[PDB]
């Protein structure tokens, strides 16, 4: 089967706040900068992936600028990178330089923010959806006792409630930066606790932090890979009205979730 070895695929890459990876100004030359920009059909947001671990727009490869953290990400002539092992994209959407371990990052949410190579901390600003469909995926999130996560207390808290079809506050928008956001108010993100004394999961203003990065694993958990923990119902009791961050464990069913879209 020759379809097991596809020689290339042209797609888009969308991250922080649903904005796309964009070669600033569609500039040809080496070191041309790569930015966060509103998604569109233009050629300089089209990214072709290859078996040699390169990611290409305008016939040139995406690459980190320096060895250490902080510097920009740029397109450059591919021949420069034919004996380089290139990018590995992790299961979560973390796009990493193989030899350097630096990851694609957006330090601000603003249009034309410079994308950069930084130390990976699994922040939402370092999470990316490789795909042509860049829109947030609207869905309910069903968990313990077949109940839905609902945004509560004027979009400050989140807990489980009996699922009601088309009930506004039980719908969530899943963004290309692995954030889970209130569908009625997409400035707000579901977040692990910023207070060290509480494990309680809340809704807060989106900020690209590690607290707001959530990965829906094939094993049915909703993982915060930065804090090495998963969403869990407090004591496996939905009537406590508390969703918490806990180490992954098979005891109970409180860490099992279904995406119903």
């Amino acid at each position: 089967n020759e379809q097991c070895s596809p020689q290339q695929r042209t797609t888009r890459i969308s991250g922080r706040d649903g904005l796309c990876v964009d070669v600033y100004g569609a500039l040809t030359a080496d070191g041309s900068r790569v930015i966060l920009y509103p998604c569109g059909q233009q050629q300089n947001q089209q990214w072709t992936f290859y078996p040699d671990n390169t990611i290409r727009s305008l016939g040139k490869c995406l690459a980190t600028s320096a060895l250490s953290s902080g510097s920009n990400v740029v397109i450059t002539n591919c021949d420069y990178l034919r004996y380089d092992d290139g990018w590995m994209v992790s299961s979560s959407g973390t796009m990493m330089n193989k030899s350097s371990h630096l990851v694609l990052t957006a330090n601000a949410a603003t249009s034309r923010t410079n994308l950069t190579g930084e130390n990976n901390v699994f922040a939402a600003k370092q999470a990316w959806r490789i795909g042509n469909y860049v829109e947030p995926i609207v869905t309910t999130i069903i968990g313990l006792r077949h109940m839905c996560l609902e945004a509560t207390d004027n979009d400050t808290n989140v807990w489980l409630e009996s699922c009601v079809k088309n009930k506004t506050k039980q719908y969530w928008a899943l963004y290309s930066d692995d954030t889970i956001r209130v569908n009625n108010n997409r400035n707000l993100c579901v977040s692990s606790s910023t207070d060290s004394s509480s494990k309680l999961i809340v809704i807060r203003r989106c900020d690209g932090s590690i607290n707001q990065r959530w990965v829906f694993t094939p094993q049915g958990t909703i993982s915060n890979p930065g804090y090495e923990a998963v969403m869990d119902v407090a004591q496996n009791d939905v009537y406590l009205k508390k969703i918490v961050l806990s180490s992954a464990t098979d005891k109970g069913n409180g860490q099992q979730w279904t995406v119903f879209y």
Partner: protein, 247 residues
């Protein structure tokens, strides 16, 4: 044999039934970067079938034989009788339901073959508790008029449910609410593309988790979402296992 009976029937036991079904189908499963288990391939015939019992409220039981390579029904045995799809593996007769009066059904185990002979599509065929019950009965008696539709009901409610947690959830809602449903584009598009998604997801090992071709999965609003990578939670947190496609 793994079982789902009407006595012990609810959202919870159905969920448990599906978990154990998935677990037993994915014994010895291979894994890739996606972390979604790939079903076994080139399995010796003598161990290529997983037997599952289903029982209605009138205690009429059928044993279904699931091909563990592709998670589709190859045959079923009711009482001392058994019935084989004409595209079931040729040697299947010698390994399962040997102690029965064996028969061949004159159609394949595919939705396409079943709908052509049944004269009815999946979108016209309601799904729920009542239809699960009727399907077990009609297969047990083997009323030829209802055999095609009964398989549409049970293939979806058991196997496609196992294949996709979204479908499992549609059946959970139908059991919990006691509300029958016909599948829409969301459920059908998953069924249509289980084999294609398997291919592309395993092909994506080559291209950093990006597919050779796009797959259009619909949502409950009938909006087509294009899945051209492993980075969609509607695929990754939905599909429970894959057909073996690539080494």
């Amino acid at each position: 044999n793994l079982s789902l009976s009407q006595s012990n029937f609810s959202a919870d036991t159905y969920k448990s039934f599906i978990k154990n079904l998935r677990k037993q189908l994915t014994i010895g499963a291979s894994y890739g970067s996606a972390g979604i288990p790939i079903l076994k391939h080139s399995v010796p015939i003598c161990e290529r079938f997983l037997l599952v019992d289903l029982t209605n409220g009138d205690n009429e039981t059928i044993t279904l034989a699931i091909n563990v390579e592709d998670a589709g029904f190859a045959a079923y045995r009711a009482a001392d009788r058994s019935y084989f799809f004409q595209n079931a593996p040729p040697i299947a007769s010698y390994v399962i339901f040997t102690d029965t009066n064996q028969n061949i059904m004159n159609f394949n185990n595919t939705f396409e073959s079943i709908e052509i002979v049944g004269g009815t599509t999946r979108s016209e065929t309601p799904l729920g508790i009542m239809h699960f019950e009727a399907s077990i009965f009609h297969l047990f008696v083997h009323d030829e008029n209802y055999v095609p539709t009964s398989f549409l009901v049970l293939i979806q409610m058991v196997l496609e449910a196992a294949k996709f947690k979204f479908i499992e959830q549609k059946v959970i809602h139908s059991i919990m609410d006691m509300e029958d449903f016909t599948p829409g584009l969301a459920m059908l598009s998953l069924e249509e593309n289980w084999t294609q998604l398997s291919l592309q997801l395993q092909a994506s090992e080559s291209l950093n988790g990006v597919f050779g071709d796009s797959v259009s999965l619909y949502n409950s609003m009938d909006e087509p979402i294009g899945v051209d990578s492993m980075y969609y939670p509607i695929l990754t947190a939905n599909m429970a296992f894959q057909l073996y496609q690539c080494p």
